[PDB]
Design a binder for this molecule. Sequence first.
Ligand SMILES: Nc1ncnc2c1ncn2[C@@H]1O[C@H](COP(=O)(O)OP(=O)(O)O)[C@@H](O)[C@H]1O
Ligand SMILES: Nc1ncnc2c1ncn2[C@@H]1O[C@H](COP(=O)(O)OP(=O)(O)O)[C@@H](O)[C@H]1O
Ligand SMILES: Nc1ncnc2c1ncn2[C@@H]1O[C@H](COP(=O)(O)OP(=O)(O)O)[C@@H](O)[C@H]1O
Ligand SMILES: Nc1ncnc2c1ncn2[C@@H]1O[C@H](COP(=O)(O)OP(=O)(O)O)[C@@H](O)[C@H]1O
Ligand SMILES: [Mg+2]
Ligand SMILES: [Mg+2]
Ligand SMILES: [Mg+2]
Ligand SMILES: [Mg+2]
Lengths: 433, 447, 442, 443, 49, 97
Amino acid sequence: LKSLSLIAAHSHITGLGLDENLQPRPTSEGMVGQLQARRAAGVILKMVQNGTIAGRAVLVAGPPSTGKTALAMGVSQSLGKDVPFTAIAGSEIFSLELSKTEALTQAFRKSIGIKIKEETELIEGEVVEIQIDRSITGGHKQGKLTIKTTDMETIYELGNKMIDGLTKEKVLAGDVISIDKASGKITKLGRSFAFVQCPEGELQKRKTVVHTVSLHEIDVINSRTQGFLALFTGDTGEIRSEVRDQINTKVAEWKEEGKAEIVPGVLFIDEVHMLDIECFSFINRALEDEFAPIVMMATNRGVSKTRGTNYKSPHGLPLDLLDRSIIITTKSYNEQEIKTILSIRAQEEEVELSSDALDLLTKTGVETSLRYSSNLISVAQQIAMKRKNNTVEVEDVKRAYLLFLDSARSVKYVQENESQYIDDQGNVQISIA
Amino acid sequence: LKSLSLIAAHSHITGLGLDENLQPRPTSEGMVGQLQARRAAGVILKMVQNGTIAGRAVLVAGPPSTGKTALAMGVSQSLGKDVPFTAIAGSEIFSLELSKTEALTQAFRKSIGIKIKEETELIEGEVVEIQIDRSITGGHKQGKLTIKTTDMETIYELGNKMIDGLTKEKVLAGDVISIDKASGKITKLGRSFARSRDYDAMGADTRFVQCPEGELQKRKTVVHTVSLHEIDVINSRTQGFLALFTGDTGEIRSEVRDQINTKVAEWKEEGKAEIVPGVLFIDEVHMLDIECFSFINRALEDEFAPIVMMATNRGVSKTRGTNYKSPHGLPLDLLDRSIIITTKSYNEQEIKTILSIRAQEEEVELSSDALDLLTKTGVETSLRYSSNLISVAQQIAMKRKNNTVEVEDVKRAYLLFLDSARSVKYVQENESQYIDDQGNVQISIAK
Amino acid sequence: TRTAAHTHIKGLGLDESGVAKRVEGGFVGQIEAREACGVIVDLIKAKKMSGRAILLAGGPSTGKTALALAISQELGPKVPFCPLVGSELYSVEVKKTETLMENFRRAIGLRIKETKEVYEGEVTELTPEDAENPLGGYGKTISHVIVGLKSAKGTKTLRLDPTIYESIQREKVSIGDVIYIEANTGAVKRVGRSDAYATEFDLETEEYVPLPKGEVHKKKEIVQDVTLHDLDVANARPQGGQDVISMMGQLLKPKKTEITEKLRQEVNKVVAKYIDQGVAELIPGVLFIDEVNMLDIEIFTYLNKALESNIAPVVVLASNRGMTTVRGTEDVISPHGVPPDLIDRLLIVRTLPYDKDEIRTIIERRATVERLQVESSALDLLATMGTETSLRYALQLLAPCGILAQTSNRKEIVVNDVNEAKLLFLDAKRSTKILETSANYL
Amino acid sequence: VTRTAAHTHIKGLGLDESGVAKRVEGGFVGQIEAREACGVIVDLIKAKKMSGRAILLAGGPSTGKTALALAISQELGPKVPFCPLVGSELYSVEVKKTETLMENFRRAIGLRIKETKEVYEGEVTELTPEDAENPLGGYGKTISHVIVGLKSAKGTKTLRLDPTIYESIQREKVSIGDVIYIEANTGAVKRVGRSDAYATEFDLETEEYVPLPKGEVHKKKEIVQDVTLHDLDVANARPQGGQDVISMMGQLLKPKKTEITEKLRQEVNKVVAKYIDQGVAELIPGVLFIDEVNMLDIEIFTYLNKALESNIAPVVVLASNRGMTTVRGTEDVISPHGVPPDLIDRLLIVRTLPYDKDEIRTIIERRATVERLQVESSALDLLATMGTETSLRYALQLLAPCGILAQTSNRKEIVVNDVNEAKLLFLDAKRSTKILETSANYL
Amino acid sequence: KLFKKNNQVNRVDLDFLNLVFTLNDKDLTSYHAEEISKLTCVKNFVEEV
Amino acid sequence: VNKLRCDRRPIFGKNLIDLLTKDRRVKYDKSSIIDNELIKPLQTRVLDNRKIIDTFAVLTPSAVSLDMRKLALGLNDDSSVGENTRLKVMQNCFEVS
Ligand SMILES: Nc1ncnc2c1ncn2[C@@H]1O[C@H](COP(=O)(O)OP(=O)(O)O)[C@@H](O)[C@H]1O
Ligand SMILES: Nc1ncnc2c1ncn2[C@@H]1O[C@H](COP(=O)(O)OP(=O)(O)O)[C@@H](O)[C@H]1O
Ligand SMILES: Nc1ncnc2c1ncn2[C@@H]1O[C@H](COP(=O)(O)OP(=O)(O)O)[C@@H](O)[C@H]1O
Ligand SMILES: Nc1ncnc2c1ncn2[C@@H]1O[C@H](COP(=O)(O)OP(=O)(O)O)[C@@H](O)[C@H]1O
Ligand SMILES: [Mg+2]
Ligand SMILES: [Mg+2]
Ligand SMILES: [Mg+2]
Ligand SMILES: [Mg+2]
């Protein structure tokens, strides 16, 4: 809530949309079709919410336009809060100043999270009067405060830290403040009549405090003194394995202690069809690690030459990954399913579509691609408002189609437009004669 | 004259050989020939002096030793001082510490320069005496100090804040100090000459300068010739001058470049600072990487784009960074937004005139027939070879001690030092003697 | 008054949501192209759609960069505009991914408007308002502080609660010196002494400010604009003057590291906290990347990943390429060098060359911008040679033509002057021809 | 005692006053042409008028390129600066090679500077500031300028001393009665130690008890020290150091090397021109010698194409030992000695020559004299032969084992048996590859 | 100690010779240097001579 | 003394101190904003993250070399740096917080 979410291709989807028996509905919670894909996503969701097992990774593949990252975003938002989810681009790991392997280790460690619980006490009430006893030279200030609520009205002496805090900020006796004795923080809630705060109930309460923390930040702050600034800036790396396994043992004994509970998150890695065999071997090893969070791995390339090896590795991946990784495959969408997805998008972005206009938009999306339809349904809004009506007509979308080209038709055009452009050598005819 | 007088490759050319109507005399200014090239170079120089338009590039085409570098440096000399001229090489830009785009950014920045003027109002005067009632009344009694100059002298009141200011930079009078009228900051320059005999040895602080002449406070404007790149550096770092001298620029981000451009525009519209047209020259640009080509193509359209000079002797050859070839070894995109000047080899008359002027620059007296045979060598060999031949013949002559360089002197100089053709022939006929490329060479002499 | 083959473009040359005029804003031809451009500009002004990309394709001399400058001009200085090239992505200091991310966050900008009442002027008088404390005490008890303030054409006396004494202690101003006061938050600020007091002391270091213009009390508006990238840098870079980290910032080489994503999400959260309150407001920017062909496949994949973000502004791509091998994989040959995955995710516009009449208009408009005039004969011959040689060769010959006309003292150009201008300088085709006809390695 | 490493047998070219090289002189036998050309190059460099010239030496190995380079370096003299350089040495890791080679170019030329300073000595008794009897209304009379009467046995003077020199005095923690040494200009403070008068005060003391050095208080000395240009370059770019905390921090800031801008170089050039007009300094030229140039990157060749164009470029002599070789950093650029023609257009080619049997005999006997080792005629003939058919280098390497085999046999002369045993125990490249041809597993 | 042999006999200070100007900009305005250079007052010692 | 004056006086800086202090200076006035509270500087971040930094700092460098810290900067009883340089750096480090 209260967070920015602009119009995006993954904003419309909200949750997986599948029953308690994990049979998805044909159109529910943002997705249309891909029933087997959605039920597999629910399978992964129950895997991650169980949390008993670790070291699980999956392959989602197929041609483009199959909603792979759509399903990834759906399962991520189904995870929602109370669980960390990390999405990392495959090409992002390539760094020249940061070691690839330990950066990958900290990428895994970011997914793993630790929740620590503690109970703190606090006093809340309406301030009554402000009185202090200090000296101009000798200091030794002795402040006193009268606090009140709906039932209790009492006076307390104000210690040196509290009087310093009360002086450091402009305070009014009509203000309502909350103080935690252990930490000494001052929480100025509101003000009395000059003015929103109206305290009630017990004067002093005790409440629990929970910190959602990932193992990665423990590791970086405990690696060295400058770990704090490295975390807040990103200029870290090459963390020694000694602190690594020491913190691993510490969190293991804390988990068996019951003081704090671990939450093994989900890691998302993308377009790994372009990557290194170093990465493949290291993740092959790391999947067997005891502290291995569930890893989501996505790809789009079929058989191709894996970078770092001469041979064309099948599926763009080495066989060792395929030995330990389970595959999830997604099919295409029918014309009716594409129309339903377009209707869902239109409802999300609130543009009126004519029935014939929407039908021809669907047929031309099936003809060319659905990304083309996604951008056409956006430009149709401005085409329709330039004629001063939110409804999008057939002429709006046809004007958009004749205005913007598709990839295939532009390819054919440059086939008839070869001479006007340089070749791979660089030969062009800028002239006309 | 302020630079080294050591004879460079072209120590005989000083400026441009054109007239007011841009017509080159056949032999003038120290460079001979290249009449069309001279006229084109003068056109470019006149346009630089105009400075009304920018974002243009110019290239010179010709074989080695044709005068491309000679023409470029003659144009630079005719440009004169106080006009920012930057000369860089296509090889040095490959920096292991700086990005090539960032290095090219500084290369463009240094070419353009800015003149900034500033006015100062300071009070200059030798102090006569200081009397402060620090004990009778104490607490900054507003004492009176008398200040003298060679033409006038007045007494100045001292305020409480002035009492505190004079408490620092303590002066016991008998000393020439100056205080800024605006900021009230006092600078202790040096004592009077009467203090020279106080002690035999003094430290590096005590100095004895003359009393300031004229009125007490004076107005003076100071103009600075400061280009954009150094301002970028000094704004990037708390102390940017050390980075300027050492070169540790730290890859200045482009975020401050827009701010400095806006400040430059503000000073221009206010009249505080004015820009000066600049010239950028790169030699042997034929070797270059395609990222640099793309960045040059982009930056040529910016408003802050000085004229860029290229030199290249390569024919249609491959460009570095790509497998395919191109004219001049340069992409056609650069050739699209550029003007190309053609230069040719000198004839025997031009060659002998060049030899004579080079000998005059070397202060080497020659003979007529010696000059003829040297010209024959220069036409058979390259032009740069006969100059070295006559250079060595000068010392062989002074070994012989018979004034002018002799015919047999040049003959023996040529005999002792192999030409490129003779060297190649000797290498080919003795490829066994030399270590071949494959790594095989005959070491034994007896068969 | 200087330019570099530009500044003759005046926006897009459109009309009120209609068809653009044939020759408007320094434009000729490409009416459909610049109408689509105006559609793009309207989409940007909508500030609703996120992560939308577009690429324009064509040959050389097609004026793609001129069109991009047209978008930049039509946007206005208020809307941020960040030009970019694929060459600078390859950075020695830091990875290309982080440079792309920073150039991405540079386009977006944040605006904040601030309101505050101001009391200012010369302090005419200072006096406390003594009263009786509720609890009996022999000591004094002040209930208010009355300050007499004098500004231009107006004076004011204001009561202040005696808590203002701490502020006046923090300021150390007594009388004859101009101060600064704000209504609600209180506190005092000292600007300088009254200008009329300069004659009291012959020599002093204190510049005496004049009486503030206008009334004593004022209410002015504060408007500030900052890009989210600048806020990221400020929240990341350390600042200090004495602490050890302060000169650890110094005595070293300050390098830009990869900013942690937690800092970015936290600054997004605080931007949300200040935009729902109304203090802040977000306007999307645009990243203009030309010659995108030079970028590697890694950059293309990261763009594919990042175009779906919800702080993703519109990004415009410029390239003159077509069926060309993609950098990174020789086998993969894709249109405009960009892999088709991005192309499906963006829109594409085709650009066409210019006709003889359009080249004539370009030449004449450039001459007018240059403030140099061309007669009919030279204009016609220059148009013909530009049609046969190239656009840029005709475009860039105006300065040599002008200087040569100036040498002959004629204000305008003539036939033999432009003939000489052609003679001195050769174009790419002539250069290539003399290259093959020369055996001297030239 | 006497150490020899393939050199010290040559004492320069040693040419005649007419420039003709005699047959045998200074470790050189024959080789008239190269020695005469080298003497001509010496005449070039001693002219002190020309700059930017360069020359390359060519030929097969073992012909004495290193010998000739060392000969010209020796005959130039230690006063004349020389900068040896190897091709592999150029490739650095902190800064690009252009800065390194400009650094070497500046290092080539030198400049001697005339300077005069003042000398002071004596023991210390007084630690008092200026009394300043007149208060003047501004001084609570006291100053960080300690007046010390410099008690030398031959003279005494009270000096108003800077806070820095008195701070250095406090650094030495001087007391009453100890010799001190101070400078008029720099104020450098060094103490030889406490005086011998206080020696009897302490039965033991870490501070050394020293007598007062003989001499007047104020003494004046002049120096004409020669300092190369690039030491001043690095000193100007980076301050060398100082005893103060501020200088400690300043030199703690940036001790690593980076590029050198030309503006400081030109300002230094102008002030040196002012000095030579004053006569304070006189410039001397420089020589730069580069080893094994065939490996240089094409970028280095392109930059050196314009490096000689600069007026500050001194004479640079070059050596290469390749034939038809492609230039390193290139693909199809093949040329003699692996160097692009654009560079060699301005260069001068000189070629070394092989030698006849008598020359091998002469060099072998010269070497035997160099290591003061006496050999018989038959062993000399065998060494000369096997050197002719195998190499000079192999014979030179096995010269010492022959003497060792003689010594372990209690013989002071090398015999036929000695060289035969050395050949039994050592094999040259030819039989090395002969053995390695018939290898079970690359024997 | 083996390195601190007397070098003052053959060392140049180079600081009194105003060749360390890179540290001079720390505490020097340009116009102050310009005016203090032109006040190189000769003949004041020569008149005493 | 005459030659000392003739040599010491011609000491001129590279560009200036007024130039750097005027280019560094900005004509913009204060124009205070909420950015002071918005930034929450790094030192304040360390101050406000006290709870986490004290609850998640457990390990120790099980081995350390005593007195090597003094020699890391070179300050000790016997060193090439000045006698009271070490005293001054120790004192200012005592005041530096
Ligand atoms: N079932 C679905 N529901 C909603 N949107 C979908 C669905 N399937 C696909 N999409 C759309 O298709 C796009 C898929 O893009 P992505 O998953 O990133 O890669 P690919 O195009 O290769 O599948 C998403 O942006 C999403 O909006
Ligand atoms: N105008 C000229 N007058 C005299 N000598 C010239 C002239 N132009 C070139 N030279 C000769 O050419 C040589 C330098 O050639 P250069 O111009 O550097 O080759 P490139 O054209 O490859 O840069 C010098 O030795 C110089 O004597
Ligand atoms: N509509 C137009 N009217 C006039 N000139 C134009 C127009 N469009 C482009 N130009 C010209 O094109 C030039 C910019 O071309 P550019 O975009 O850099 O080349 P390309 O499009 O081949 O990359 C400008 O200098 C401008 O003069
Ligand atoms: N003409 C010569 N006279 C005397 N010694 C020679 C001669 N030629 C070579 N040498 C010997 O060769 C040795 C150096 O060989 P070097 O020059 O390094 O081989 P390269 O020819 O491969 O450079 C010297 O010790 C020297 O004694
Ligand atoms: Mg996907
Ligand atoms: Mg050249
Ligand atoms: Mg363009
Ligand atoms: Mg050798």
